[PDB]
Ligand binder design. Structure first.
Ligand SMILES: CCCCCCCCCCCCCCCCCC(=O)OC[C@H](COP(=O)([O-])OCC[N+](C)(C)C)OC(=O)CCCCCCCCCCCCCCCCC
Ligand SMILES: CCCCCCCCCCCCCCCCCC(=O)OC[C@H](COP(=O)([O-])OCC[N+](C)(C)C)OC(=O)CCCCCCCCCCCCCCCCC
Ligand SMILES: NC(=O)C1=CN([C@@H]2O[C@H](COP(=O)(O)OP(=O)(O)OC[C@H]3O[C@@H](n4cnc5c(N)ncnc54)[C@H](OP(=O)(O)O)[C@@H]3O)[C@@H](O)[C@H]2O)C=CC1
Ligand SMILES: CCCCCCCCCCCCO[C@@H]1O[C@H](CO)[C@@H](O[C@H]2O[C@H](CO)[C@@H](O)[C@H](O)[C@H]2O)[C@H](O)[C@H]1O
Ligand SMILES: C/C=C(/C)[C@H](O)[C@H](C)/C=C(C)/C=C/C/C(C)=C/Cc1[nH]c(OC)c(OC)c(=O)c1C
Ligand code: SF4
Ligand SMILES: [Zn+2]
Lengths: 134, 208, 156, 114, 95, 47, 146, 342
């Protein structure tokens, strides 16, 4: 087990459903011996002899640029085209639709409160679940 | 008559406006702005080249005679390019008046020293240099005055942290007072006190 | 034993002489030193306890830190303390000396004189009233009274 | 990009004042070591002088080099007149301070700082 | 009340108590843990509920200007008492 | 007080206590709050 | 209100398995020394990674580069997204191309298999706002959720 | 780790190092350096003391508020030893005397007390036990103190099998009884040296390095159960050392030989002193027992400390033994001593 930081505890990049890139900021530091998540993999890489070419948050985001350059355009929606192409590649898929009704995982406010790990560690969300249930 | 609001006077504000025009007509090469506050205090804002001539005229002129340098100090305003506002508060015993003369400076643009005009300024200019790092030309003895020997930085600059960077303790291994990076058992707690509602409509800035 | 008893009363004898003659070093820093002058004033007359101010650290027993200790003055305070012959005691008087006080967060202040010298008695207040300092001084005599140097030498 | 000079009109006329300050600092180490009864050698003191002059080896603005020279003269004067003490002179040598490792792994083991 | 932990340390009224293996217990060796033994929660529960006629009652804590700021409590919810938000006294309507 | 006694209270100390500094009764400061961050407890069984 | 889950069940210390198979606290230098030791053996298909629902891009790219440096390409995510057709080749395939503020300009919304009220609560807020002011017509292919 | 010992901060006084050490013997020469190093990095330090409170005052300013805990103990009473080692994750033993008293002989100080501490530390559940011994500790040793140290090492490792044993050579520092001992021979005009000091080799070590490696052993994973040899980087014949010392103090050096039995008999006279002996027979023996050659034992450098030469630091010990005429003489005015590779 390698204790990593939480989103409140690091400056991290997340991309929302629109594709907009935006960044968190450190509010508190990680507890105990936890470490920022990208520096554990960088610490791990040097022990194993395949050192990765980045030693600071700046250099890691420069590397994010090299991959997908819209992950450093913060708060920016980058327009995308070429949907027509994706469709033309989708008309060839020979798979067919089953007859199952489309039932979402969350039907009622009961299933809303506890989905991910942090939601499940919360004593306030447990009350909310117990509140609507009973 | 309002028993809670400060009496306003009338004549003094008119007198200091007349003298402010007087000073601006005579030193047009140096004066950049003249104003009188509602407290009734005259301010002359000069180009820094004009410091020595401006304080010399105000000291030796017969209808001025501002012979006492009440004090000299700087204000740090980082948003300005010339972030240091130098303020001279002068006193006229002949006319029982006061006057403020202000100029500006940056980090790399020293001001002339008025020690030739007011010996009182000698230590005041040492204090500006020490606390704000504003160098003065022609100072007889420009050196720190208030900070510890070999203190690095200018602690009254707005971007200098309140607790500083180093602290002292006695180290029994080396048998002397040593300097080390600052760590506080309790951090200074910053309070956000500003109210989000405007208190003075008279000072509202245009949103341009 | 008899010798262990005699050592005890010899211990009280030497303590008593140090309790009864505390010579503080003429040395004050800021406003706390004004209240230290009031303790010397007629109403409290510390002299009546055998407390006499002596200017030279060689002739002084006690160093009362009565005011703020800045970084510029920190080495000098330590030097006059080192030059005090032993036994020697420090009374830290006031918030400034106790822990920085009103200037705890200043870049130029030592956050407590006990980072520089060992302190025996802490006297709270800003400033402590002359009686508060007097209570602290008399609390230092009781500390000396509890000294057990000779007895501990016997059991070595 | 035009600005009033302090003293020097360009970097070459400013390096002249730098070497002249380095000379003075170089002549004074053997006295500081002798008068302050420092527990170092002259060679070790003079090396420390050189180390501080090389801390500002990247400065190029002539006005900046004027104000480093101005400060260094103030520092020289505080030492020649013995306004500084052993503690003050010895602070340049950071003898009680363990130095923070400059490698990623050691920083990573030691805490959250970069 | 002043419960005692299995480790033998007294538990303060805020429920704090060093664990068994917390080293910070060493500060109490040859000394003591300062604990206040008059738990305000236990003392306030001992007071009887004052009964009043009207449906709205003002509490200032007693002593007038020596109490807390004067507030009013509704007494309609005739199943629980009205509690002062400052002093913790309880009120209930007569009928 | 023999003529103007203080108001009695059930929490007022009955027994005074003088300066207990240096003695085994001396006050010792400590944090009166409880733990804030709770750590995960691993399972006590193999997987 | 869920931030209070950040204060319970936290991993604060590296852990490894001891000889009885239980997790025990260890040190960073120790724990990384185990993972590097195993990483130096396996390569290619024998090493894979899964990214969870709360991982930063600075850690996905970092974990990508590491595994690509031992030949592996099994970088996966718990979420499923059809990789047939274009797959993730074109961003337009897996994004909200009209944006969140584009809902305010449409005049019909067709929802296919989703309860936006709970999946994207503030995106359902932006729909109702257009439903209220711009008189947006809304249709749902799926279950008759509220 | 328990949540109250995880190290935070940056290794300043207000930081937390995760070390909770009970240092037995902190009131001595090496003790103030061990506590200072522990205290400066932000370690809780428990300090058992038997002396008067006045004698532990100089340690009070070695830790931030709360980081130092002074406890009264009597080495005869076991219950007081438990009271101190009860909350520690490391226990460091520095107890020792250079002479015997009525109430404690070399066996007590160097065998029983260390075993009593180690026995209580094992029962209390202490992770590390650091025990200081001596480089020339050995059961075939002339010196009575140095044989007991050899026994004590073994007692300690019987009841604490994983104990770390530190073997320093002669420690030299401001308060040492090594360079200040020879600098004080000047009071007797001449310097009696057995065989004129040419048969004895010494490899003295600076106290701050001993203390800095002892503290580094409180956190080094690769130290449990090892024995270390802490020694200076230079070996000198006793003669050249004693000659160099007088060069550093600028006193007149007049060495003459003195047979070990006449020298041993003098040390017995000074040992009659009811106070702290100026010398003793055992101290005279130890001065002439030659330092062992370092053969297969990890040293200072394995604990991340670089030995400090006797040349860098002599003047801070010996300047107070000068007269006014030489107070200001600099380190360079003295010719360095001559080293030997055997
Ligand atoms: C040189 C001459 C020596 C003679 C003086 C020594 C006696 C000191 C005690 C004394 O005189 O005052 C009583 C002192 C006074 O006690 P005290 O000093 O605690 O009281 C001071 C506080 N007020 C003023 C409120 C009373 O008694 C003692 O506590 C000390 C007794 C020690 C006696 C020495 C041991 C016997 C000698 C062997
Ligand atoms: C006028 C004359 C006043 C003297 C009256 C008689 C009292 C004599 C008591 C000794 C004088 C005080 C000396 C002292 O404080 O040191 C204590 C010393 C210190 O005890 P120690 O040996 O345990 O201290 C060791 C050094 N330290 C603590 C720093 C590690 O004890 C003595 O040896 C005094 C012996 C007393 C015997 C009387 C004759 C002494 C000459
Ligand atoms: N040159 C050196 O200094 C060398 C030292 N060592 C070893 O290092 C350790 C310390 O060296 P050093 O510091 O010089 O020793 P010290 O002479 O400084 O005395 C060390 C400590 O031992 C304590 N002590 C002695 N006897 C007792 C006792 N009977 N009961 C309780 N405490 C006692 C003393 O406490 P109090 O002062 O209250 O008696 C003192 O604090 C010793 O083991 C020593 O042999 C090893 C090699 C060389
Ligand atoms: C035939 C005659 C031959 C000449 C005699 C043989 C030499 C024997 C004496 C050697 C020198 C004695 O000198 C003595 O040195 C010891 C050893 O540190 C010092 O011993 C003491 O000094 C101070 C006193 O508080 C302490 O800090 C120190 O820790 C303690 O050891 C004495 O202060 C000094 O007086
Ligand atoms: C002569 C012997 C005695 C017993 C005398 O009665 C008294 C007790 C000693 C005196 C007067 C001073 C004692 C210590 C000291 C040096 C104080 C600092 C000080 N001293 C001032 O003035 C004198 C000030 O003046 C504004 C100060 O601000 C300060 C800060
Ligand atoms: S504690 Fe108060 S009275 Fe004393 S020196 Fe500081 S500011 Fe002055
Ligand atoms: Zn109330």
């Amino acid at each position: 087990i390698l204790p990593g930081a939480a989103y409140t505890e690091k400056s991290a990049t997340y991309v929302n459903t629109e594709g907009r890139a935006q960044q968190t900021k450190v509010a508190v530091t990680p507890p105990g011996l936890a470490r920022e998540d990208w520096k554990i993999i960088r610490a791990l890489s040097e022990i194993a002899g395949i050192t990765l070419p980045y030693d600071t948050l700046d250099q890691v985001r420069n590397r994010l640029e090299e991959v997908s350059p819209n992950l450093v355009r913060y708060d920016d929606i980058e327009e995308t085209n070429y949907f027509q192409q994706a469709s033309e590649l989708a008309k060839l898929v020979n798979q067919e639709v089953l007859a199952d009704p489309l039932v979402p995982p969350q039907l009622t406010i009961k299933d809303f409160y506890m989905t991910d790990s942090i939601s499940r560690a919360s004593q306030t969300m447990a009350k909310c679940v117990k509140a609507v249930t009973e | 008559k309002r028993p809670t609001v400060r009496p306003r006077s009338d004549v003094t504000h008119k007198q200091l406006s007349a003298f402010g025009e007087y000073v601006a007509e005579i030193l047009p090469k140096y004066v950049q702005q003249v104003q009188v506050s509602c407290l009734d205090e005259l301010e002359i804002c000069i180009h820094p080249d004009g410091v020595i001539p401006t304080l010399t005229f105000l000291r030796d002129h017969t209808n001025a005679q501002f012979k006492s340098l009440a004090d000299l100090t700087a204000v740090d305003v980082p948003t300005r390019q010339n972030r240091f506002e130098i303020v001279y508060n002068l006193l006229s015993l002949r006319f029982n008046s006061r006057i403020r003369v202000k100029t500006y400076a940056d980090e790399l643009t020293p001001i002339d020293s008025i020690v030739s005009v007011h010996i009182a300024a000698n230590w005041y200019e040492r204090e500006v240099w020490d606390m704000f790092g504003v160098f003065f030309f022609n100072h007889p003895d420009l050196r720190r005055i208030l900070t510890d020997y070999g203190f690095e930085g200018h602690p009254f600059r707005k971007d200098f942290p309140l607790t500083g960077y180093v602290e002292l303790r006695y180290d029994d291994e080396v048998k002397r007072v040593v300097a080390e990076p600052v760590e506080l058992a309790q951090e200074f707690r910053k309070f956000d006190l500003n109210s989000p509602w405007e208190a003075f409509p008279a000072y509202r800035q245009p949103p341009e | 034993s008899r010798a262990e008893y005699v050592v005890t009363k010899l211990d009280d004898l030497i303590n008593w002489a140090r309790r009864s003659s505390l010579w503080p070093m003429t040395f004050g820093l800021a406003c706390c030193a004004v209240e230290m002058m009031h303790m010397a004033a007629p109403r409290y007359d510390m002299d009546r306890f055998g407390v006499v101010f002596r200017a030279s650290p060689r002739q002084a027993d006690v160093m009362i830190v009565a005011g703020t200790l800045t970084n510029k003055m920190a080495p000098a305070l330590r030097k006059v303390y080192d030059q005090m012959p032993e036994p020697r005691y420090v009374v830290s008087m006031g918030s400034c000396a106790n822990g920085g006080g009103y200037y705890h967060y200043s870049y130029s202040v030592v956050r407590g004189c006990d980072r520089i010298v060992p302190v025996d008695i802490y006297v709270p207040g800003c400033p402590p009233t002359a009686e508060a300092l007097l209570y602290g001084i008399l609390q230092l005599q009781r500390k000396i009274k509890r000294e057990q140097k000779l007895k501990i030498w016997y059991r070595r | 990009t035009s600005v009033k000079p302090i003293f020097s009109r360009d970097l070459n006329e400013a390096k002249r004042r730098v070497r002249e300050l380095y000379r003075a600092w170089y002549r004074e180490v053997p006295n500081t070591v002798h008068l302050m009864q420092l527990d170092i050698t002259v060679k070790q003191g003079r090396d420390k002088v050189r180390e501080m002059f090389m801390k500002n080896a990247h400065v190029t603005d002539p006005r900046v080099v004027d104000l480093l020279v101005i400060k260094g003269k103030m520092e020289l004067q505080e030492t020649i007149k013995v306004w500084k003490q052993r503690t003050h002179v010895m602070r340049f040598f950071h003898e009680t301070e363990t130095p923070r490792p400059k490698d990623f792994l050691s920083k990573f083991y030691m805490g959250h700082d970069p | 009340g002043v419960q005692v932990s299995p480790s033998g340390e007294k538990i303060t009224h805020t429920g704090q108590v060093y664990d068994e293996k917390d080293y910070r217990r060493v500060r109490f060796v040859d000394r003591q843990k300062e604990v206040n033994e008059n738990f305000a929660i236990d003392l306030i529960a001992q007071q009887p509920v004052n009964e009043v006629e009207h449906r709205i009652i003002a509490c200032d804590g007693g002593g007038g200007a020596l109490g807390h700021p004067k507030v009013y409590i509704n007494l309609d919810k005739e199943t629980k008492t009205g509690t002062c938000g400052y002093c913790g006294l309880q009120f209930k309507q007569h009928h | 007080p023999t003529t103007n006694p203080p108001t009695a209270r059930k929490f007022i100390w009955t027994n005074h206590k003088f300066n207990v500094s240096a003695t085994p009764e001396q006050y010792v400061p400590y944090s009166t709050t409880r733990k804030k961050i709770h750590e995960w407890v691993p399972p006590s069984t193999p997987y | 209100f869920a931030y209070d889950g950040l204060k319970r069940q936290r991993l604060t210390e590296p852990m490894v398995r001891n000889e009885k198979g239980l997790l025990t606290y260890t040190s960073w230098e120790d724990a990384l020394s185990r993972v590097a030791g195993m990483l130096q053996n396996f390569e290619g298909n024998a090493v894979a990674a899964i990214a969870g629902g709360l991982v930063d891009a600075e850690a996905l790219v970092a974990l990508k580069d590491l595994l690509n440096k031992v030949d592996s390409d099994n970088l996966c995510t718990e979420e499923i997204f059809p990789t047939e057709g274009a797959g993730t080749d074109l961003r337009s395939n897996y994004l909200l191309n009209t944006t969140i503020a584009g809902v305010e300009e449409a005049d019909v919304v067709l929802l296919v298999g989703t309860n936006p009220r709970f999946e994207a609560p503030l995106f359902n807020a932006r729909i109702r706002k257009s439903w209220l002011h711009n008189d947006l017509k809304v249709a749902l292919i799926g279950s008759p959720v509220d | 780790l328990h949540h109250a010992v995880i190290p935070h901060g940056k290794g300043g006084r207000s930081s937390v190092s995760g070390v909770v050490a009970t240092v037995f013997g902190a009131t001595g020469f090496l003790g103030r350096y061990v506590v200072n190093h522990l205290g400066r990095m932000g370690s809780q330090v428990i300090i058992p003391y038997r002396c008067d409170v006045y004698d532990i005052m100089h340690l009070r300013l070695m830790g931030d508020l709360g980081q130092l805990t002074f406890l009264e103990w009597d080495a005869r009473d076991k219950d007081s030893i438990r009271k101190a080692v009860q909350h520690s994750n490391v226990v460091i033993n520095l107890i020792g005397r250079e002479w015997e008293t009525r109430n404690f002989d070399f066996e007590d100080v160097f065998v029983n007390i260390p075993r009593a501490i180690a026995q209580a530390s094992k029962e209390a559940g202490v992770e590390r036990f650091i025990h200081v011994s001596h480089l020339n500790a050995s059961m075939k040793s002339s010196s009575k103190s140095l044989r007991s140290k050899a026994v004590g090492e073994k007692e300690v490792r019987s009841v604490f099998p994983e104990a770390i044993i530190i073997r320093p050579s002669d420690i030299f520092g401001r308060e040492d009884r090594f360079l200040n001992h020879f600098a004080n021979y000047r009071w007797f005009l001449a310097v009696p040296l057995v065989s004129l000091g040419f048969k004895t080799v010494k490899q003295p070590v600076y106290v701050a390095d001993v203390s800095k490696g002892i503290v580094n052993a409180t956190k080094d994973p690769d130290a449990v159960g090892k024995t270390f040899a802490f020694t200076g980087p230079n070996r000198y014949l006793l003669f050249h050392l004693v000659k160099y010392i007088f060069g550093m103090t600028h006193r007149t050096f007049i060495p003459y030989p003195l047979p070990l039995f006449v020298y041993s008999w003098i040390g017995k006279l000074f040992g009659l002193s009811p106070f702290e002996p100026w010398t003793t027979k055992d101290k005279v023996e130890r001065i002439h027992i030659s330092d062992v050659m370092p053969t297969d034992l990890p040293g200072l450098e394995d604990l991340g400390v670089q030995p400090t030469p006797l040349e860098l630091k002599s003047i801070e010990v010996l300047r107070r033994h000068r007269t006014y005429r030489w107070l200001s003489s600099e380190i360079e005015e003295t010719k360095p001593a001559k080293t030997v590779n055997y």
